[PDB]
Structures are given as C-alpha cells and as structure tokens.
PDB file of C-alpha atoms and ligand atoms in Angstrom:
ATOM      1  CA  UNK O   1       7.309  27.431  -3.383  1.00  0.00           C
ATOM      2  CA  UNK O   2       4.771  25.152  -5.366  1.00  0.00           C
ATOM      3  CA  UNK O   3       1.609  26.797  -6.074  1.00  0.00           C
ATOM      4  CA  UNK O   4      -1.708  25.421  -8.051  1.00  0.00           C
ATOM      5  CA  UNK O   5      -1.052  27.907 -10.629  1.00  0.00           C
ATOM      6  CA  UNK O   6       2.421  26.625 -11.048  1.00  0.00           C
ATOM      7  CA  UNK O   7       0.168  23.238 -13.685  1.00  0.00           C
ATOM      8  CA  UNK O   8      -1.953  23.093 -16.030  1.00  0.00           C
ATOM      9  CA  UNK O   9      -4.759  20.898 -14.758  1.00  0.00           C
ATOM     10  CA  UNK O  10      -6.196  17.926 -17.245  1.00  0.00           C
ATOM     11  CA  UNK O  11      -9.313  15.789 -17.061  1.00  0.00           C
ATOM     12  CA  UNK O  12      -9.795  14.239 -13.576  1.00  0.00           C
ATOM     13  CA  UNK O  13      -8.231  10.929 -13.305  1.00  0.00           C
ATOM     14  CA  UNK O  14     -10.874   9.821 -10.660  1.00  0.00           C
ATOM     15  CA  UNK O  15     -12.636  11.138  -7.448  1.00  0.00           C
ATOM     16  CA  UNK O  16     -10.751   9.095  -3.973  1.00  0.00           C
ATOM     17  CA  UNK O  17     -10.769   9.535  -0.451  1.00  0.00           C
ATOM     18  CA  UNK O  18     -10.986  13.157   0.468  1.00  0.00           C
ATOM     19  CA  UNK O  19     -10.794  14.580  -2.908  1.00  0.00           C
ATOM     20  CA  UNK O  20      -9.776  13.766  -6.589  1.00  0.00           C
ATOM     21  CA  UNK O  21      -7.032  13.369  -8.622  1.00  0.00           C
ATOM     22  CA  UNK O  22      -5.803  14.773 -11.259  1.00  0.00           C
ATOM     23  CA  UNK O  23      -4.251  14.082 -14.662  1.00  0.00           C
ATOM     24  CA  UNK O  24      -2.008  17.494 -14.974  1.00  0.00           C
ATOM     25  CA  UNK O  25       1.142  18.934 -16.470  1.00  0.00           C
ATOM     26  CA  UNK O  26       4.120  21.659 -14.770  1.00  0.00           C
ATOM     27  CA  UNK O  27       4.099  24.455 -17.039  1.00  0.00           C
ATOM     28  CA  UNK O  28       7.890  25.410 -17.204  1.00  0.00           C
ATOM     29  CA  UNK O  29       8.777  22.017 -17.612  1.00  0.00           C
ATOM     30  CA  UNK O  30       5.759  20.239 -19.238  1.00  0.00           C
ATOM     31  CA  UNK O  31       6.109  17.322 -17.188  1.00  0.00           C
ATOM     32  CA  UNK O  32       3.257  15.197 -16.789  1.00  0.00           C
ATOM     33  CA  UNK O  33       2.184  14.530 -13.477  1.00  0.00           C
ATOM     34  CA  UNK O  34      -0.796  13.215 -11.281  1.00  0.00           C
ATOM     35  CA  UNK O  35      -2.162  16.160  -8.778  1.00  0.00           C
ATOM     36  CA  UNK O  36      -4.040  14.388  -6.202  1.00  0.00           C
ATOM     37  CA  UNK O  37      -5.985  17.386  -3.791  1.00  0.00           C
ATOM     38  CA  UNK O  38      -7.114  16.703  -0.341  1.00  0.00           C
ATOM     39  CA  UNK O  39      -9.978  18.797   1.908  1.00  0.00           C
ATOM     40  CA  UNK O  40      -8.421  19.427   5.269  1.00  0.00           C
ATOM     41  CA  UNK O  41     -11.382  19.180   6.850  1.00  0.00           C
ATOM     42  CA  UNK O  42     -11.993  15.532   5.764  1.00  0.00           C
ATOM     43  CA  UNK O  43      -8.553  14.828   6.980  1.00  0.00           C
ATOM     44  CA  UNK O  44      -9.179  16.117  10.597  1.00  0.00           C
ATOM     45  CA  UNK O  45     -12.797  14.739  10.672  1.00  0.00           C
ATOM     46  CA  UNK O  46     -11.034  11.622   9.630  1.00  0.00           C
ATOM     47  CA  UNK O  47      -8.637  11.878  11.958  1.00  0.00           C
ATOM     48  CA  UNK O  48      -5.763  11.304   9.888  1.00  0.00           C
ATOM     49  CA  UNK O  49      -4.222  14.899   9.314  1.00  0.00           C
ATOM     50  CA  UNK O  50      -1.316  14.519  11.103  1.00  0.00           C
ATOM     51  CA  UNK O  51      -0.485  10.861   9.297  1.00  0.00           C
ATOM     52  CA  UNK O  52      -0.431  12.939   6.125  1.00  0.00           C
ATOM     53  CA  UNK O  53       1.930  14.853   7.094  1.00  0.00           C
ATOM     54  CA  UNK O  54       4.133  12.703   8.124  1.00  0.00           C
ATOM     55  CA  UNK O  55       4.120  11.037   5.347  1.00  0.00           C
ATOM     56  CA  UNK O  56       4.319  13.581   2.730  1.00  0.00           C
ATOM     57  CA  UNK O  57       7.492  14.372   4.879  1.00  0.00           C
ATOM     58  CA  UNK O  58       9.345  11.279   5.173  1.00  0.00           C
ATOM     59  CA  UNK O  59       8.576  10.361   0.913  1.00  0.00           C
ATOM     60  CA  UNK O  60       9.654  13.752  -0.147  1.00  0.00           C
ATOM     61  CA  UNK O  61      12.839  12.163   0.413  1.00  0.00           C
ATOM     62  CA  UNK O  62      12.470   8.711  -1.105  1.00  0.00           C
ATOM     63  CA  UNK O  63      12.936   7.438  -4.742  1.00  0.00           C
ATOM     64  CA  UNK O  64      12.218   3.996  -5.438  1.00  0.00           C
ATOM     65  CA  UNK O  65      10.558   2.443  -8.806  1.00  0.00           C
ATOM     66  CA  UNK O  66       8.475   0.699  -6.929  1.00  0.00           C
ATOM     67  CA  UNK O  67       6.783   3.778  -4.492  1.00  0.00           C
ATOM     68  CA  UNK O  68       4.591   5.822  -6.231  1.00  0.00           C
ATOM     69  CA  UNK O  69       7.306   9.487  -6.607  1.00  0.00           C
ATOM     70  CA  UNK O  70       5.840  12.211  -4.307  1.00  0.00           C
ATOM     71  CA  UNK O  71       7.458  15.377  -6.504  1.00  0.00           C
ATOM     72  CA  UNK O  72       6.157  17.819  -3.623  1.00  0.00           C
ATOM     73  CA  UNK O  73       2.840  18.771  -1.947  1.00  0.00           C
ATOM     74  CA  UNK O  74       1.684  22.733  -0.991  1.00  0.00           C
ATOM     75  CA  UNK O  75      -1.341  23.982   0.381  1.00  0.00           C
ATOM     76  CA  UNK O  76      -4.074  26.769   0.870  1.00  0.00           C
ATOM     77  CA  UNK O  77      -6.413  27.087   3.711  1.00  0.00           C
ATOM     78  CA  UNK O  78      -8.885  24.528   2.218  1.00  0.00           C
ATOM     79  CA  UNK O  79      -6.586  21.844   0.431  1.00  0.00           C
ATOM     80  CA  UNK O  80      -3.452  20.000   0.783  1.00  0.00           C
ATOM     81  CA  UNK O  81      -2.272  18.934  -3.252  1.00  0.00           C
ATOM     82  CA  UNK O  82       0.169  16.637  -3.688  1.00  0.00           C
ATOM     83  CA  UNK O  83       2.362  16.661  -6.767  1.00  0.00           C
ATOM     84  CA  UNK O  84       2.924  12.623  -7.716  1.00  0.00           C
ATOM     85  CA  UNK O  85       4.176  10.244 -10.315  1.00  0.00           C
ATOM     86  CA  UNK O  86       1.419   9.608 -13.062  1.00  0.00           C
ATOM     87  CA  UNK O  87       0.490   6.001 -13.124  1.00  0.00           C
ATOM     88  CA  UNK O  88      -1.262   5.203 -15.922  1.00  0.00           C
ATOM     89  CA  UNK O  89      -2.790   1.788 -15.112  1.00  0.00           C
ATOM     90  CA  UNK O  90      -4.740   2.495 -11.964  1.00  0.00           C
ATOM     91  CA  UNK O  91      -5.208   0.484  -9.185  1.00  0.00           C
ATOM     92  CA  UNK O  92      -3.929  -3.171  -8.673  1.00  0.00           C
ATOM     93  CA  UNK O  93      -7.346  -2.880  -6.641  1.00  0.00           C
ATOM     94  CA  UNK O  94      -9.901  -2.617 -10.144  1.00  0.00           C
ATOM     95  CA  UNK O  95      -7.918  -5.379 -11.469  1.00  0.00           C
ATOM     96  CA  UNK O  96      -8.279  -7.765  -8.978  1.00  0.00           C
ATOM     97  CA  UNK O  97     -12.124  -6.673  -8.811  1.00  0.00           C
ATOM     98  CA  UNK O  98     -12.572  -7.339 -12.716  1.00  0.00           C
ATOM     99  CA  UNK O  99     -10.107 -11.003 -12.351  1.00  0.00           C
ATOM    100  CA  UNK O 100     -11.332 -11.922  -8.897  1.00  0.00           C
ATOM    101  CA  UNK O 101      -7.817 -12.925  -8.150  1.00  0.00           C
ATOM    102  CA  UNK O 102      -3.896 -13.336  -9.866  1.00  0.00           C
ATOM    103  CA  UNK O 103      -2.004 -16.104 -11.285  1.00  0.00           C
ATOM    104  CA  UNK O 104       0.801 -17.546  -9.326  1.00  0.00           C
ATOM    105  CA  UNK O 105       3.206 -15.343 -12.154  1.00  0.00           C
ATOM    106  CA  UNK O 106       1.704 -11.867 -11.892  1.00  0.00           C
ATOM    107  CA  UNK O 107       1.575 -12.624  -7.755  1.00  0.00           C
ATOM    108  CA  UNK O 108       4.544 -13.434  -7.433  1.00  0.00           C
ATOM    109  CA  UNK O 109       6.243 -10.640  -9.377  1.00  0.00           C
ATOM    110  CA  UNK O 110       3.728  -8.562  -7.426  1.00  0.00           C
ATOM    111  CA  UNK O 111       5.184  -9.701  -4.096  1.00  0.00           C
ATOM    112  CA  UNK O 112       8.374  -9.314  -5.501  1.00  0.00           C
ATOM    113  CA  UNK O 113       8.626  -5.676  -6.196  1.00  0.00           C
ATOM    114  CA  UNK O 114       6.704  -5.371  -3.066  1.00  0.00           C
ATOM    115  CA  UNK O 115       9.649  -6.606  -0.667  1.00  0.00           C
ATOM    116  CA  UNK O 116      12.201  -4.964  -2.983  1.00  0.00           C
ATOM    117  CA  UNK O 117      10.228  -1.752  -1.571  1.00  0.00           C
ATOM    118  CA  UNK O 118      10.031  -2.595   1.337  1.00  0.00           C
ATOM    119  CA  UNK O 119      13.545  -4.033   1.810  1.00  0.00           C
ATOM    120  CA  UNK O 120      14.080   0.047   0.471  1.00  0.00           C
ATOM    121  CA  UNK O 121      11.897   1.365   2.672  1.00  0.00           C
ATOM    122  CA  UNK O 122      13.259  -0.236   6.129  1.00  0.00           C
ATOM    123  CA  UNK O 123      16.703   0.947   5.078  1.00  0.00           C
ATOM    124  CA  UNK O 124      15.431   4.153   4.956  1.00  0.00           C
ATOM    125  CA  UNK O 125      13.799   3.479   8.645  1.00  0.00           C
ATOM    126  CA  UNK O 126      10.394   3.558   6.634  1.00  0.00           C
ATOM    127  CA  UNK O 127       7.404   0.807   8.027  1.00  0.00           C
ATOM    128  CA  UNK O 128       4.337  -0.066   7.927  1.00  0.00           C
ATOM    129  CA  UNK O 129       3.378   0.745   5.008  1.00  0.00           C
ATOM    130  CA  UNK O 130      -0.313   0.281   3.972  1.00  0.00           C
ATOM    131  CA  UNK O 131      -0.270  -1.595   0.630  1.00  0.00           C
ATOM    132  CA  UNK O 132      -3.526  -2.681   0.279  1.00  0.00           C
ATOM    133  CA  UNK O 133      -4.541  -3.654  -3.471  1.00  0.00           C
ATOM    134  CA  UNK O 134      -6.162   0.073  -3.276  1.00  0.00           C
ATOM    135  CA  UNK O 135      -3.280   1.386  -2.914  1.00  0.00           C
ATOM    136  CA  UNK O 136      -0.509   0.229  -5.345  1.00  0.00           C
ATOM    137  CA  UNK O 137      -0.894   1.834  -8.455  1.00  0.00           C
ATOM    138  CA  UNK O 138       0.341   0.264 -11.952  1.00  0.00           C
ATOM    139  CA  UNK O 139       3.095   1.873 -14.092  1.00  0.00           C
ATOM    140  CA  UNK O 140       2.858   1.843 -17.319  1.00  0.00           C
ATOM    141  CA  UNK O 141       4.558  -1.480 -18.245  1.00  0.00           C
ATOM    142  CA  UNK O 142       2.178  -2.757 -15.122  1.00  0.00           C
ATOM    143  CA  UNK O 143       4.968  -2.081 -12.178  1.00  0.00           C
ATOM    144  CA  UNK O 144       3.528  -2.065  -8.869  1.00  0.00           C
ATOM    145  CA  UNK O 145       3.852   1.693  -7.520  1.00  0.00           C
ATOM    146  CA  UNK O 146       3.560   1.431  -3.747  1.00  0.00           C
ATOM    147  CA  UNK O 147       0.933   4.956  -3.020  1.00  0.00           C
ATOM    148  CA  UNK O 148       0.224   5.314   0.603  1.00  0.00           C
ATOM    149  CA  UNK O 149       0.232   8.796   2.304  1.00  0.00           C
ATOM    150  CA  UNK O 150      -0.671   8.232   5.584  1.00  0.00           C
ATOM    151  CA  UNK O 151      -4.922   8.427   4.727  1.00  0.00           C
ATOM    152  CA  UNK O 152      -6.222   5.350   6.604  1.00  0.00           C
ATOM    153  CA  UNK O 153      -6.549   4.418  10.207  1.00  0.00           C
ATOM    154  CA  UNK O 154      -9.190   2.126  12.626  1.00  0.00           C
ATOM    155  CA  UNK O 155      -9.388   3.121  23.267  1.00  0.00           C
ATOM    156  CA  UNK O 156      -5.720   4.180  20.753  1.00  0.00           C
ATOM    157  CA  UNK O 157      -6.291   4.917  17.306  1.00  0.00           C
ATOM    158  CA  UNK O 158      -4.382   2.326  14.566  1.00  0.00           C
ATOM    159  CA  UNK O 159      -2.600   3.481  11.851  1.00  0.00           C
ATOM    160  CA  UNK O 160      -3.353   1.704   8.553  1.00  0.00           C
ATOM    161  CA  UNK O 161      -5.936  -0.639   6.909  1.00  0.00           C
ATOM    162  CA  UNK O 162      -7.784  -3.412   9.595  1.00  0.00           C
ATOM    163  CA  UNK O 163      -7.451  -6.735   7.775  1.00  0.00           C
ATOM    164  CA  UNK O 164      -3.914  -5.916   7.063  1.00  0.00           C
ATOM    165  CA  UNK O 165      -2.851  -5.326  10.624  1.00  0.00           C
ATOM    166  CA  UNK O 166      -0.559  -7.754  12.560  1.00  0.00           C
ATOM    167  CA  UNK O 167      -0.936  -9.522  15.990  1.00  0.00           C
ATOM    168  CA  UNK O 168       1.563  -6.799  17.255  1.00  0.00           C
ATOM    169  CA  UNK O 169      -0.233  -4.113  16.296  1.00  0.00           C
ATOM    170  CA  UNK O 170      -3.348  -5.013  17.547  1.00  0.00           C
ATOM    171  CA  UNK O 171      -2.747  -6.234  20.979  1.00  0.00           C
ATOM    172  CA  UNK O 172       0.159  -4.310  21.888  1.00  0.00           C
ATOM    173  CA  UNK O 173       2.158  -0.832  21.694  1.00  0.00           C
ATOM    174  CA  UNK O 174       5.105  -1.962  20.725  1.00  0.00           C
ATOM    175  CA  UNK O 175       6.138  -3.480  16.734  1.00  0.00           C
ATOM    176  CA  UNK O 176       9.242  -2.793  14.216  1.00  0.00           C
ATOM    177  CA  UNK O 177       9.559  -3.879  10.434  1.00  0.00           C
ATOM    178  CA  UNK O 178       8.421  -7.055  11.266  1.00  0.00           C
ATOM    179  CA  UNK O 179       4.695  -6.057  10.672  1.00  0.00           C
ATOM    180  CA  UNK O 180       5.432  -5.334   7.083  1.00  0.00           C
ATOM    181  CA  UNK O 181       6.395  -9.030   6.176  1.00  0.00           C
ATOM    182  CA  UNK O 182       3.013  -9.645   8.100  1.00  0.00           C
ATOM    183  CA  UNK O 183       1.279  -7.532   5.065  1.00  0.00           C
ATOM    184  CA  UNK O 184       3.203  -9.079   2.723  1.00  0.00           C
ATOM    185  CA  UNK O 185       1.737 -12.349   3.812  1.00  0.00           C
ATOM    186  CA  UNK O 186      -1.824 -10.606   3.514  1.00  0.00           C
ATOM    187  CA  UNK O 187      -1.270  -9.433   0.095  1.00  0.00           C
ATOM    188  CA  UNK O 188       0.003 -12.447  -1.098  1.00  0.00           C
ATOM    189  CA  UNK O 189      -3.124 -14.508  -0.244  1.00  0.00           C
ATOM    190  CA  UNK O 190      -5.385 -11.911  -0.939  1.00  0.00           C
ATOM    191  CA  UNK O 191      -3.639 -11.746  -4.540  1.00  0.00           C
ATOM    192  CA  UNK O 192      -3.751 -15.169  -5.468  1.00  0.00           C
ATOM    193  CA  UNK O 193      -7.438 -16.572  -3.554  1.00  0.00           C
ATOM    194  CA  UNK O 194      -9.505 -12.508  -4.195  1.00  0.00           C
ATOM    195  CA  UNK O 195     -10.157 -11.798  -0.273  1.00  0.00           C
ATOM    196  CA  UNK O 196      -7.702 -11.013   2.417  1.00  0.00           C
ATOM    197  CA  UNK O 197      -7.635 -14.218   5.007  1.00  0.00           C
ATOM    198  CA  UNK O 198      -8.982 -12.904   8.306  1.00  0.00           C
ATOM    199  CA  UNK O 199     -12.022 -11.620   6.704  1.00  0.00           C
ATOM    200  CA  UNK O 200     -14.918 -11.652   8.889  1.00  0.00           C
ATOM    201  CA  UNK O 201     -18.124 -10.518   9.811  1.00  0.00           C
ATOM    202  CA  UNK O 202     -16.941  -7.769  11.965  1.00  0.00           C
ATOM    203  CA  UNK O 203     -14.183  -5.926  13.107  1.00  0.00           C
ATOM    204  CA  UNK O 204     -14.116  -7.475  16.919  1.00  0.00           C
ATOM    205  CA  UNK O 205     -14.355 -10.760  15.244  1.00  0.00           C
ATOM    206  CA  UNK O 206     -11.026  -9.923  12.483  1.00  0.00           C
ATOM    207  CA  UNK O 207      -9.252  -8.703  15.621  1.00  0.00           C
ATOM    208  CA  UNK O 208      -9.597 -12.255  17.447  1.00  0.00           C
ATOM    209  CA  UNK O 209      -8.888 -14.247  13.974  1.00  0.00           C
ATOM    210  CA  UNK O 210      -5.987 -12.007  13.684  1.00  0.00           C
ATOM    211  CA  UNK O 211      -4.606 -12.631  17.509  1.00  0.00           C
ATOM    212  CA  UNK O 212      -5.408 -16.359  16.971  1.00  0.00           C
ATOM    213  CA  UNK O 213      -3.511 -16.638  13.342  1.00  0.00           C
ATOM    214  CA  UNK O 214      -7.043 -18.267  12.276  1.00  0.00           C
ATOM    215  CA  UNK O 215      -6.863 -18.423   8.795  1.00  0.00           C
ATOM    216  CA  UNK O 216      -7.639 -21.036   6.274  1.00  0.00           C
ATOM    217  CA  UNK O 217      -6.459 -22.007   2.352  1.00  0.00           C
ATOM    218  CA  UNK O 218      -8.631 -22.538  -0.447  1.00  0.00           C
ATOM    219  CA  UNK O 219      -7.742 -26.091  -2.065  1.00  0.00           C
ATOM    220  CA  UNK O 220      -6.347 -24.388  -5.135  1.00  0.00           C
ATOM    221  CA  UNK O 221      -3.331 -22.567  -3.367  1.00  0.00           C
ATOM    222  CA  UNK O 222      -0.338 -24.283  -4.177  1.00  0.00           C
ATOM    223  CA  UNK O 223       2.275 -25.995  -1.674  1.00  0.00           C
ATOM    224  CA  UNK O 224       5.071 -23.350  -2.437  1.00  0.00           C
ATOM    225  CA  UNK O 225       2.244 -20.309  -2.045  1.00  0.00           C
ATOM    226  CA  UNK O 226       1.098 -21.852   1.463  1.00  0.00           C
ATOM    227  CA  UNK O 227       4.574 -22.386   2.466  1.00  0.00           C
ATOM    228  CA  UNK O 228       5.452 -18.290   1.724  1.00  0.00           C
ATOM    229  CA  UNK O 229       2.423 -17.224   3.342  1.00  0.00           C
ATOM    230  CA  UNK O 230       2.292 -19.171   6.196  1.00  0.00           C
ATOM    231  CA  UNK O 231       6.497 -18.192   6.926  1.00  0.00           C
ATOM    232  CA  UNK O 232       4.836 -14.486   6.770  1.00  0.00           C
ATOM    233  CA  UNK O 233       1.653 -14.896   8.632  1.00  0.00           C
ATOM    234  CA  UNK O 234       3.800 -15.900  12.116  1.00  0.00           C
ATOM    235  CA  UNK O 235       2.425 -14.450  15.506  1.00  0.00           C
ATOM    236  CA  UNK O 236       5.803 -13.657  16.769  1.00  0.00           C
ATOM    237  CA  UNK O 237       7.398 -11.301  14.753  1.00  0.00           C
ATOM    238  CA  UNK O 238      10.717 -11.997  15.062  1.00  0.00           C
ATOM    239  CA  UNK O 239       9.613 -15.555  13.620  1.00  0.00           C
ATOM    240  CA  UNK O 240       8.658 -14.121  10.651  1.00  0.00           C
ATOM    241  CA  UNK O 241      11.102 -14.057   7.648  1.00  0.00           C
ATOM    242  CA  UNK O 242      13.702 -11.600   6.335  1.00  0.00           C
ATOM    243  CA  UNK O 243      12.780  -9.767   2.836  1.00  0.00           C
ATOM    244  CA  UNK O 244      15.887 -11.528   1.179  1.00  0.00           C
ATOM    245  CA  UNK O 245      14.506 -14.699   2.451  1.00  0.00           C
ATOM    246  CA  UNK O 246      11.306 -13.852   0.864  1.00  0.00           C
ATOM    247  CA  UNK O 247      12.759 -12.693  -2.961  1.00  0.00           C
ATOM    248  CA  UNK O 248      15.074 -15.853  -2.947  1.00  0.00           C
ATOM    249  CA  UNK O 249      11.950 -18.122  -1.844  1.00  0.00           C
ATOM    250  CA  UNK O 250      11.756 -21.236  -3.929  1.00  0.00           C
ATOM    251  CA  UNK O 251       8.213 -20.095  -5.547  1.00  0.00           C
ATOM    252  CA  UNK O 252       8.531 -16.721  -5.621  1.00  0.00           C
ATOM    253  CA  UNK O 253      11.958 -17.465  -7.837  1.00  0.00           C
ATOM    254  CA  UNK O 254      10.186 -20.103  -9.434  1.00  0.00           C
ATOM    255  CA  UNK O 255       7.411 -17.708 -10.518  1.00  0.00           C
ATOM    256  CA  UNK O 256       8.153 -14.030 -10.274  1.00  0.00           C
ATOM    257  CA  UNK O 257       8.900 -12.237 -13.376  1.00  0.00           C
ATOM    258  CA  UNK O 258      11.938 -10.018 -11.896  1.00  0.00           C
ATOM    259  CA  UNK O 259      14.794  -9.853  -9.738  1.00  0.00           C
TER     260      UNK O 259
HETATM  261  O1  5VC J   1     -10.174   5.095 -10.508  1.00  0.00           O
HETATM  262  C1  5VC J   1      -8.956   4.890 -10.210  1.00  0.00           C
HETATM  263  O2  5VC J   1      -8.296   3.849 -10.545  1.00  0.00           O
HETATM  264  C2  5VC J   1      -8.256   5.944  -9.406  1.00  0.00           C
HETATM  265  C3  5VC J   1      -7.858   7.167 -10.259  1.00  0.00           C
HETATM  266  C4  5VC J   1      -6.841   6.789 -11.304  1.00  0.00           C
HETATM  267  C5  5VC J   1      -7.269   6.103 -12.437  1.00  0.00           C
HETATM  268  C6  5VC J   1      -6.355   5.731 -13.418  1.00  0.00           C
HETATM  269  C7  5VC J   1      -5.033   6.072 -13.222  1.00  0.00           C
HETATM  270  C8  5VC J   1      -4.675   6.761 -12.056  1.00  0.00           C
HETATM  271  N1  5VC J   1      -3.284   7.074 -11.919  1.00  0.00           N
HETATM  272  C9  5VC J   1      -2.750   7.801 -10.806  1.00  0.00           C
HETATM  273  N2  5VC J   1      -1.479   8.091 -10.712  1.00  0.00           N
HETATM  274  C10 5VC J   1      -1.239   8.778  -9.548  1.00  0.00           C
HETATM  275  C11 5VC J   1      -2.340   9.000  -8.761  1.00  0.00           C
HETATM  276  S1  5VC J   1      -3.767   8.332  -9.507  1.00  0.00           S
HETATM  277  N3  5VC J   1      -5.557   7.111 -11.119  1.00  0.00           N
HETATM  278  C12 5VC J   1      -9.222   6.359  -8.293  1.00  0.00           C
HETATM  279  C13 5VC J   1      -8.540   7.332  -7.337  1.00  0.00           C
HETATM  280  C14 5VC J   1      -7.306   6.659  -6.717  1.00  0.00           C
HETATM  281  O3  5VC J   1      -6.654   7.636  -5.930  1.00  0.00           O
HETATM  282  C15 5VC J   1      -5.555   7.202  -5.238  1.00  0.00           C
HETATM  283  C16 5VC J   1      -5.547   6.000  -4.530  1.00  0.00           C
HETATM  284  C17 5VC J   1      -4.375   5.669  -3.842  1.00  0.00           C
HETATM  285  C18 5VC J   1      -3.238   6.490  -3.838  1.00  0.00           C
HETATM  286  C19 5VC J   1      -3.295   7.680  -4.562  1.00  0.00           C
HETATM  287 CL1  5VC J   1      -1.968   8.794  -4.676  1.00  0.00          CL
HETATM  288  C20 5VC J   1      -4.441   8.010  -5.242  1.00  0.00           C
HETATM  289  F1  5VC J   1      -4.451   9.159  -5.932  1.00  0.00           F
HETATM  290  C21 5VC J   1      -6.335   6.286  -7.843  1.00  0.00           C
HETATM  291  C22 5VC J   1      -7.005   5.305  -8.801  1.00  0.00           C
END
C-alpha cells in the first residue's frame, strides 16, 4: 500500500542508527509526520532485522499517548521506512546530556507515564521494552513518547540495551513482565543521579554488578526515590512491584505531575 511517493519529504530531523529521520507530510491528507528510513543491510549486519520486524508488527496495532504512534512502515529492496508520530522535542536523551540529570518533579512524572505504558503495553502481552533516555521522545507539551522498534541488542544474542537488562535476562532463558519494572528502576536512577547504576568499566564487569544487584546511591537521592528504586531493582522478579504499586507510590504521588 504505502509507498515513498505517497509524502512529501521535509528537512531531515536528524541522522540515527541505520539511517535518518525525517520531518515529512502525507500528501492526500497533509498530515505531518516523522519518516524514519532504515538500510537493510545495517539491520542484518547488526543483527537485528528480524527484531524490527517484529516490532513494527506488534505496534501497528497499539495506540497509547505515551508510545511513540507507528502509522505504518513499507519497503524497497534497500530500505525499510517507517511512518511515525512527529515528536517535536527530541530525545529525553539530549536533555539529560545538556541538565546532567532531572528534578524529583519532571522524574517522577517521567516514570509515571512510563508505567502507565507499560501497564498498556503488558495488557496488550507487550514486554521488554527498551526505554532508554535515547529512546523516549518528547511531545510537544514534553510527554514522554515511548520509541523503540526492536534496533538494539548485545553464546545467545540479548535483545535490548546492556545496562538496562535484568538479572533474568542475563543469566537465564526464561523472564515475563517482570523485567520491565527492572528498567523502570534503571530509568528512574539514571533520571534523577545522570548515569544508569551498574555502570562499569566493561560489559563482563556490568553483567556481574547486575547478577549481584551491586549498585550504590549518590547522597543526594532522596529516601522516597531510594525506596522506589530499590522495590524495582529486586533480583527475583516476582519480588519486584506491580505498575499500580508503582503510580500510587508515596513519592511518585507526592511528585509526579499526572495521573
Ligand atoms: O537529534 C535528535 O534528537 C533525533 C532526531 C529528532 C530531533 C528532533 C525531533 C525529533 N522528533 C522525532 N519524532 C519521531 C521520530 S524523530 N527527532 C536524532 C535521531 C533520533 O532517531 C530516533 C531515535 C529513537 C527512536 C526513533 Cl523512531 C528515532 F527516529 C530521534 C532524535
């Protein structure tokens, strides 16, 4: 159905993994849009071609304000485009470079529209999402737009981002919706201190710390924060919380912005 000559094609928005993006507008309709395209080779070469696909799949069919809207997606013999929500604040990712980190307010409203998503998303039998500050993009009224497509992995090959991964995922074969309150926990910290807490040297090294829960708090991190992340950051996973518990959590009321 869809075909590139089926938009008119703006200024590039900015150049990501395995291609750019595009600011761009359906002709019929003159809806604006974001056309993100992808080299296929990159994607096989990168070993994540058949994540993509997946994904593009399974979102065709979700709507959420808080997931970035995947319109469609069609392809040639060079490039996969996908045909997504506009979001004209960029990534969560720049700001947090230009800040260094959050406020307990914006975090928490962060984390907030986060599990609302989520809570969504394992409804819809949807997990393990990768939402990594590089990808959640910002509406324009600075809503968090969840924007994964399947594009990162790290013997098996891992699905997803390294220092976001959960104890589950690493050691074993085996892990549910569990792993996302795991991110959440990530995020969370990494939102409010500027670094994600099993950072380390190398990736044998974040593996153990990860196994081990071996993470530590800046002195600045307030009780209530601690309290959240630490509930989220359990080894077990059927320890960890459930996403109402986390959007009816003392400091996460006490702070976020939004239901
Ligand atoms: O410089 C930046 O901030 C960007 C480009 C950029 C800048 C400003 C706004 C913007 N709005 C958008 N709305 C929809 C898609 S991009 N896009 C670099 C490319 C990055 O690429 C992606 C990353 C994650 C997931 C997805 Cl679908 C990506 F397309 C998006 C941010």
């Amino acid at each position: 159905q869809w075909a590139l000559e089926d938009f008119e094609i703006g200024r590039p928005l900015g150049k990501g993994k395995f291609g750019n993006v595009y600011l761009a507008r359906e002709k019929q309709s003159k809806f604006i849009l974001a056309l993100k395209v992808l080299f296929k080779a990159q994607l096989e070469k990168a070993g994540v071609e058949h994540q993509l696909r997946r994904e593009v799949e399974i979102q065709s069919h979700l709507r959420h304000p808080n997931i970035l809207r995947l319109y469609g997606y069609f392809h040639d013999a060079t490039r996969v485009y996908l045909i997504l929500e506009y979001a004209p604040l960029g990534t969560v990712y720049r700001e947090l470079q230009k800040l260094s980190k959050f406020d307990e307010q914006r975090t928490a409203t962060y984390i907030t529209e986060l599990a609302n998503a989520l809570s969504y998303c394992h409804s819809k039998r949807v997990i393990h999402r990768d939402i990594k500050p590089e990808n959640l993009l910002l509406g324009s009224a600075g809503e968090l737009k969840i924007a994964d497509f399947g594009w990162s992995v790290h013997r098996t090959t891992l699905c997803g981002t390294l220092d976001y991964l959960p104890p589950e995922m690493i050691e074993g074969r085996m892990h549910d919706e569990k792993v996302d309150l795991w991110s959440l926990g990530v995020l969370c910290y990494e939102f409010l201190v500027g670094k994600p807490p099993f950072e380390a040297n190398t990736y044998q090294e974040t593996y153990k710390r990860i196994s081990r829960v071996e993470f530590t708090f800046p002195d600045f991190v307030t009780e209530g924060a601690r309290d959240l992340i630490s509930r989220l950051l359990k080894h077990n996973p059927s320890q960890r919380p459930m996403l109402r518990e986390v959007l009816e959590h003392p400091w996460i009321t006490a702070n976020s912005s939004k239901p």
